[PDB]
Short mmCIF file of C-alpha atoms and ligand atoms in Angstrom, two decimals:
data_model
loop_
_atom_site.label_atom_id
_atom_site.label_comp_id
_atom_site.label_asym_id
_atom_site.label_seq_id
_atom_site.Cartn_x
_atom_site.Cartn_y
_atom_site.Cartn_z
CA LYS A 1 4.41 13.28 5.54
CA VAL A 2 5.57 10.46 7.83
CA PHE A 3 2.81 9.05 10.03
CA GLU A 4 3.39 8.01 13.61
CA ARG A 5 2.47 4.33 14.07
CA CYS A 6 -0.76 4.67 16.08
CA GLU A 7 -1.75 7.82 14.17
CA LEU A 8 -1.73 5.75 10.98
CA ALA A 9 -3.52 2.82 12.64
CA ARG A 10 -6.38 5.13 13.65
CA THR A 11 -6.55 6.75 10.20
CA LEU A 12 -6.70 3.41 8.38
CA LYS A 13 -9.37 2.09 10.75
CA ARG A 14 -11.36 5.27 10.22
CA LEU A 15 -11.07 4.70 6.46
CA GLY A 16 -12.46 1.16 6.63
CA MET A 17 -9.19 -0.77 6.56
CA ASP A 18 -9.84 -2.99 9.59
CA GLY A 19 -10.79 -6.34 8.09
CA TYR A 20 -11.15 -5.12 4.52
CA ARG A 21 -11.51 -8.19 2.30
CA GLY A 22 -10.61 -10.15 5.42
CA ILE A 23 -7.29 -8.34 5.90
CA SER A 24 -6.54 -7.02 9.39
CA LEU A 25 -5.39 -3.53 10.37
CA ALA A 26 -2.18 -4.99 11.82
CA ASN A 27 -1.44 -6.57 8.45
CA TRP A 28 -2.08 -3.25 6.70
CA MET A 29 0.09 -1.56 9.34
CA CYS A 30 2.95 -4.01 8.77
CA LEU A 31 2.59 -3.52 5.01
CA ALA A 32 2.82 0.28 5.23
CA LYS A 33 5.73 0.06 7.66
CA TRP A 34 7.88 -2.11 5.39
CA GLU A 35 6.72 -0.61 2.09
CA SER A 36 7.36 3.05 2.91
CA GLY A 37 8.14 3.51 6.59
CA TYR A 38 4.74 5.23 6.87
CA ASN A 39 5.95 7.90 4.43
CA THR A 40 3.32 9.33 2.02
CA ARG A 41 6.03 10.91 -0.13
CA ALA A 42 7.96 7.69 -0.71
CA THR A 43 8.69 6.76 -4.34
CA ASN A 44 10.71 3.89 -5.79
CA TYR A 45 11.81 3.85 -9.41
CA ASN A 46 12.17 0.38 -10.96
CA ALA A 47 14.74 0.68 -13.75
CA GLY A 48 13.61 -2.71 -15.04
CA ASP A 49 10.20 -1.83 -16.48
CA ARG A 50 10.52 1.92 -15.90
CA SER A 51 7.63 1.91 -13.44
CA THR A 52 7.55 3.70 -10.07
CA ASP A 53 5.96 2.76 -6.74
CA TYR A 54 4.09 5.64 -5.11
CA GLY A 55 3.17 6.67 -1.61
CA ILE A 56 2.69 5.10 1.77
CA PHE A 57 1.47 1.86 0.16
CA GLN A 58 3.95 1.96 -2.73
CA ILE A 59 1.35 1.45 -5.45
CA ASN A 60 2.82 0.74 -8.91
CA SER A 61 2.41 3.01 -11.95
CA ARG A 62 2.24 0.16 -14.48
CA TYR A 63 -1.04 -1.36 -13.27
CA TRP A 64 -2.75 1.03 -10.87
CA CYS A 65 -2.04 4.73 -11.24
CA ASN A 66 -0.89 6.95 -14.08
CA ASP A 67 2.37 8.87 -13.84
CA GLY A 68 2.64 9.39 -17.59
CA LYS A 69 6.13 7.87 -17.81
CA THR A 70 5.44 4.16 -17.56
CA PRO A 71 5.21 1.86 -20.62
CA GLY A 72 2.21 -0.47 -20.86
CA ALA A 73 0.45 1.34 -18.02
CA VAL A 74 -3.11 0.16 -17.29
CA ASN A 75 -4.28 2.72 -14.66
CA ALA A 76 -6.80 0.36 -13.02
CA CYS A 77 -7.39 2.88 -10.22
CA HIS A 78 -8.19 5.59 -12.80
CA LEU A 79 -6.07 7.96 -10.77
CA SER A 80 -3.00 10.12 -11.25
CA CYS A 81 -0.05 8.82 -9.19
CA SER A 82 0.27 12.36 -7.75
CA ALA A 83 -2.83 11.75 -5.61
CA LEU A 84 -0.76 8.99 -3.96
CA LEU A 85 1.82 11.53 -2.79
CA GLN A 86 -0.53 13.54 -0.58
CA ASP A 87 -0.48 13.92 3.21
CA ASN A 88 -4.19 13.02 3.08
CA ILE A 89 -4.25 9.30 2.20
CA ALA A 90 -7.94 8.95 1.29
CA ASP A 91 -7.11 8.60 -2.43
CA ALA A 92 -4.34 6.11 -1.70
CA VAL A 93 -6.62 4.01 0.52
CA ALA A 94 -9.31 3.89 -2.20
CA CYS A 95 -6.76 2.67 -4.76
CA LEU A 96 -5.27 0.15 -2.31
CA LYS A 97 -8.77 -1.28 -1.88
CA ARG A 98 -8.91 -1.78 -5.65
CA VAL A 99 -5.43 -3.31 -5.80
CA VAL A 100 -6.25 -5.97 -3.20
CA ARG A 101 -9.41 -6.98 -5.05
CA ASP A 102 -7.29 -8.53 -7.80
CA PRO A 103 -6.54 -12.33 -7.81
CA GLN A 104 -3.27 -12.29 -5.83
CA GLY A 105 -4.71 -9.96 -3.18
CA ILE A 106 -2.30 -8.55 -0.57
CA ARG A 107 0.48 -10.62 -2.15
CA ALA A 108 0.71 -7.70 -4.58
CA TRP A 109 2.92 -6.02 -1.96
CA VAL A 110 6.39 -7.62 -1.96
CA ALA A 111 7.51 -5.96 1.29
CA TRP A 112 4.45 -7.36 3.04
CA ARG A 113 5.26 -10.81 1.63
CA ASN A 114 8.85 -10.63 2.84
CA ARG A 115 8.31 -9.13 6.31
CA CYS A 116 4.66 -9.74 7.22
CA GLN A 117 3.06 -12.80 5.61
CA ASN A 118 2.84 -15.84 7.92
CA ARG A 119 4.40 -13.87 10.79
CA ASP A 120 3.07 -12.31 13.98
CA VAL A 121 1.99 -8.73 13.31
CA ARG A 122 0.14 -7.93 16.55
CA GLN A 123 2.85 -5.44 17.59
CA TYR A 124 2.10 -2.97 14.79
CA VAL A 125 -1.21 -2.05 16.45
CA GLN A 126 -0.24 -2.66 20.08
CA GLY A 127 -1.22 0.22 22.34
CA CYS A 128 -3.04 2.15 19.63
CA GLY A 129 -6.53 1.55 20.96
CA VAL A 130 -7.88 0.30 17.63
C1 LIG B 1 0.71 -2.55 -4.88
C2 LIG B 1 1.33 -2.68 -6.24
O1 LIG B 1 1.23 -1.77 -7.07
N1 LIG B 1 1.98 -3.84 -6.46
C3 LIG B 1 2.48 -4.26 -7.77
C4 LIG B 1 1.93 -5.64 -8.14
O2 LIG B 1 0.50 -5.59 -8.18
C5 LIG B 1 2.47 -6.05 -9.50
O3 LIG B 1 1.98 -7.34 -9.85
C6 LIG B 1 1.08 -7.46 -11.05
O4 LIG B 1 -0.30 -7.03 -10.92
C7 LIG B 1 -1.11 -7.20 -12.12
C8 LIG B 1 -2.48 -6.63 -11.78
O5 LIG B 1 -3.08 -7.37 -10.73
C9 LIG B 1 -1.11 -8.73 -12.50
O6 LIG B 1 -1.88 -8.96 -13.72
C10 LIG B 1 -3.16 -9.46 -13.16
O7 LIG B 1 -3.16 -10.89 -12.87
C11 LIG B 1 -4.49 -11.53 -12.96
C12 LIG B 1 -4.33 -13.00 -12.57
O8 LIG B 1 -3.05 -13.50 -12.94
C13 LIG B 1 -5.06 -11.33 -14.39
O9 LIG B 1 -6.36 -11.93 -14.49
C14 LIG B 1 -5.14 -9.83 -14.70
O10 LIG B 1 -5.67 -9.62 -16.02
C15 LIG B 1 -3.73 -9.20 -14.59
N2 LIG B 1 -3.78 -7.77 -14.90
C16 LIG B 1 -3.39 -7.25 -16.11
C17 LIG B 1 -3.88 -5.86 -16.41
O11 LIG B 1 -2.68 -7.87 -16.91
C18 LIG B 1 0.33 -9.16 -12.74
O12 LIG B 1 0.40 -10.55 -13.11
C19 LIG B 1 1.18 -8.92 -11.48
N3 LIG B 1 2.58 -9.31 -11.68
C20 LIG B 1 3.20 -10.33 -11.05
C21 LIG B 1 4.64 -10.56 -11.44
O13 LIG B 1 2.64 -11.06 -10.21
C22 LIG B 1 4.02 -6.11 -9.45
C23 LIG B 1 4.66 -6.47 -10.78
O14 LIG B 1 4.22 -5.61 -11.82
O15 LIG B 1 4.52 -4.79 -9.05
C24 LIG B 1 4.03 -4.33 -7.76
O16 LIG B 1 4.66 -2.82 -7.40
#
């Protein structure tokens, strides 16, 4: 499903996203916007290493989830990539929390790096009452 901006903001806040590991909700909002357009069914196949990015947060199948088709997969989230394609994003949020705990943190998300890092992201949560 495709979340409406404020609907997503409220869901993430409710799931403990606001300030997680020091990262703001607006930053998470910007990340989701540019990674998937708030679409939980979004998938991106990377011909290079044969890995795929899954869900609203576009989490990669080589290091975080298992899709059974990616070489050298690590499955750090100990979760099937299918759970990252659900309308209910609780599983995705739990894996995202694991992803960010690694050394490079939020820099793990290229779209966030390109369109959010070092920029003003206050607009993504404006008028959402979060
Ligand atoms: C959200 C998402 O799935 N993003 C993907 C990126 O996370 C991914 O980058 C790679 O992540 C792994 C795991 O964090 C990096 O290896 C970790 O790096 C630390 C410190 O360097 C090391 O101590 C860990 O052992 C190591 N993990 C393992 C299991 O080896 C890896 O270096 C990251 N790659 C790069 C190029 O920075 C990228 C690329 O795979 O894809 C995103 O979709």
